[PDB]
Design a protein around this ligand. Structure first.
Ligand SMILES: [Ca+2]
Length: 223
């Protein structure tokens, strides 16, 4: 997260870190046994870390649970990042408490101009490189589809939306991939892609979760 703020320990209780010997992507806990992330975050050998603030210090509220199965969306296209969404099933259920909690799926899609909360342990510089140890947060608005399409002509599908600031300075970044965009208490986006981070006229591009709720519910009901 570039241009954000320190969240506060366990104030984003649905945020997970995906770990394959190191933190590599975020995700969101949607019930006691399932996490949503980005398909471009796929790797073998995932451990899900819940209740994290400082990813480099064991502080006492963490739960570390290995993935039993990963399921990348059937229509994921790694070239275009269309359908950039994956489910991860935990080997055992998480214990839900004030520090570890699930986020609701949307029933309706979110509106342009809504201010959303984006969070992660990704790079904090626009260029140059500096990764935080504690969770960072950013408030950012949903942009109109026409502004999104103007910023990335020929690249935006109906399964993407843009959020952030056309002047630059505030954005998600590498390492935040797979993490949540929460608007009005619902998971509306997944950190997916962008040209750089926090560059002028190059806002963040997010997977549109509300187009996937049927697939998520059917997959969880069968696995
Ligand atoms: Ca920790």
């Amino acid at each position: 997260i570039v241009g954000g703020y320190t969240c506060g320990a366990n104030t984003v209780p649905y945020q997970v870190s995906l770990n394959s010997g190191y933190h590599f992507c975020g995700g969101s806990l949607i019930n006691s046994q399932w996490v949503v992330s980005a398909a471009h975050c796929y790797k073998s050998g995932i451990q899900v870390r819940l209740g994290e603030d400082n990813i480099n210090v064991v502080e006492g509220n963490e739960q570390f649970i290995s993935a039993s199965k990963s399921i990348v969306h059937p229509s994921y296209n790694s070239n275009t990042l269309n359908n950039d969404i994956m489910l991860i099933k935990l080997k055992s259920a998480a214990s839900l408490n004030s520090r570890v909690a699930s986020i609701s799926l949307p029933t309706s899609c979110a509106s342009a101009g809504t201010q959303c909360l984006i969070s992660g342990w990704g790079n904090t510089k626009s260029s140059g490189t500096s990764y935080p140890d504690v969770l960072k947060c950013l408030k950012a608005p949903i942009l109109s589809d026409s502004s999104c399409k103007s910023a990335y002509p020929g690249q935006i599908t109906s399964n993407m939306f843009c959020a952030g600031y056309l002047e630059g300075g505030k954005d998600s970044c590498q390492g935040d991939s797979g993490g949540p965009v929460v608007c009005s208490g619902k998971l509306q986006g997944i950190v997916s892609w962008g040209s750089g981070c926090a560059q002028k006229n190059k806002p963040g591009v997010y997977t549109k979760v509300c187009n996937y709720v049927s697939w998520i519910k059917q997959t969880i009901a069968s696995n």
